[PDB]
């Protein structure tokens, strides 16, 4: 009864397949056509202990944007599917993680209501070939399909790779917390209104 979400999503621009196990062992298996994003998805598996399987192709000759967005949308849907009615879970996650001089605080609530608060200030435009504007878009798209309340707050940082990587580490650990079983909940839905829904 591991919670597994699977999504296939295709448009004229991109083709995406995602399989995520919330109760994983950190199996990392991401190939998006965007090497830096693959590296970040590896962090999600390694530090979140999610099993993360992603395959994507797309119109990277135009730019990485459509692929990045469509991967994020599909991951969000996969998370939503895996989570189901959200019975017995912690629901909330909260973690601050460094990478050297960078320090990122991530707080999230698996509420069913999409919201992104994001204040990263990434001081360079490209990390490798990866457009650093795409980080915000990745998280925005992911929250929109997952129905997640997500806050990402930059507390320190100078190196762009460090800032983004620390964000994924903190996110992975916050998401792990939120998705894990609350040992006291007794399988009840963790909401005073009796339901958690993306509608």
Ligand X SMILES: O=P(O)(O)OC[C@@H](O)[C@@H](O)c1cnc[nH]1
Q: Find the binding residues for ligand X in span 92-111 (CB under 6 A).
A: 99, 111
Q: Which of 49, 54, 75, 82 binds a second copy (CB under 8 A)?
A: 49
Q: Which of 8, 84, 101, 181 binds a second copy (CB under 8 A)?
A: 101
Asked if 169 interacts with a second copy (CB under 8 A), we say: yes
CA distances from 124 to 1, 41, 72, 108, 120 (A): 44, 21, 22, 27, 12
For residue 6, list its beta bridge partners: 19
Look-up of token digits 């609350």:
182
Binding mask 133-172 for Mn ion (x = CB under 5 A): --------------------------------x-------
Asked if 65 interacts with ligand X (CB under 6 A), we say: yes
Query: Which DSSP letter does residue 182 get?
Result: P
Binding mask 51-90 for Mn ion (x = CB under 5 A): ------------------x---------------------
Q: Pick the closer one to Mn ion by CB: 169 or 176.
A: 169
Q: How far apart are CB 159 and ligand X at their closest, in Å?
A: 8
Neighbours of 76 (CB within 10 A): 26
Q: How far apart are CB 198 and a second copy at their closest, in Å?
A: 8
8 A C-beta contact, residue 104 and residue 176: no
Neighbours of 189 (CB within 10 A): 16
Cα(29)–Cα(24) distance, rounded to whole angstroms?
12
Binding mask 115-144 for a second copy (x = CB under 8 A): x-x-----xxxxxxxxx-x--xx--xx--x
Cα(144)–Cα(103) distance, rounded to whole angstroms?
25
Residues 121-180 that bind ligand X (CB under 6 A): 161, 165
Cα(177)–Cα(61) distance, rounded to whole angstroms?
38
Which residues are at the interface with Mn ion (CB under 5 A)?
Answer: 69, 165
């Amino acid at each position: 009864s591991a919670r597994i979400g699977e999504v296939k999503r295709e448009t004229k621009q991109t083709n995406v397949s995602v399989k995520i196990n919330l109760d994983g062992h950190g199996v990392s298996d991401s190939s998006t056509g965007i090497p830096f994003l693959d590296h970040m998805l590896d962090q999600l598996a390694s530090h979140g202990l999610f099993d993360v399987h992603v395959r994507a192709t797309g119109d990277t000759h135009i730019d990485d944007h459509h692929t990045n967005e469509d991967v994020a949308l599909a991951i969000g849907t996969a998370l939503l599917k895996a989570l189901g009615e959200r019975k017995g879970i912690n629901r909330f996650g909260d973690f601050t993680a460094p990478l050297d001089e960078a320090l990122i605080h991530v707080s999230l609530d698996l509420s069913g209501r999409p919201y992104l608060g994001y204040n990263l200030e990434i001081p360079t435009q490209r990390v490798g070939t990866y457009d650093t504007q795409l980080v915000e878009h990745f998280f925005q798209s992911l929250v929109n399909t997952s129905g997640m309340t997500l806050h990402i707050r930059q507390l320190a940082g100078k190196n762009s790779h460090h800032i983004i990587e620390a964000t994924f580490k903190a996110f992975a650990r916050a998401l792990r917390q939120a998705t894990e079983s609350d040992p006291r909940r007794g399988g009840t839905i963790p909401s005073s209104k009796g339901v958690l829904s993306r509608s």
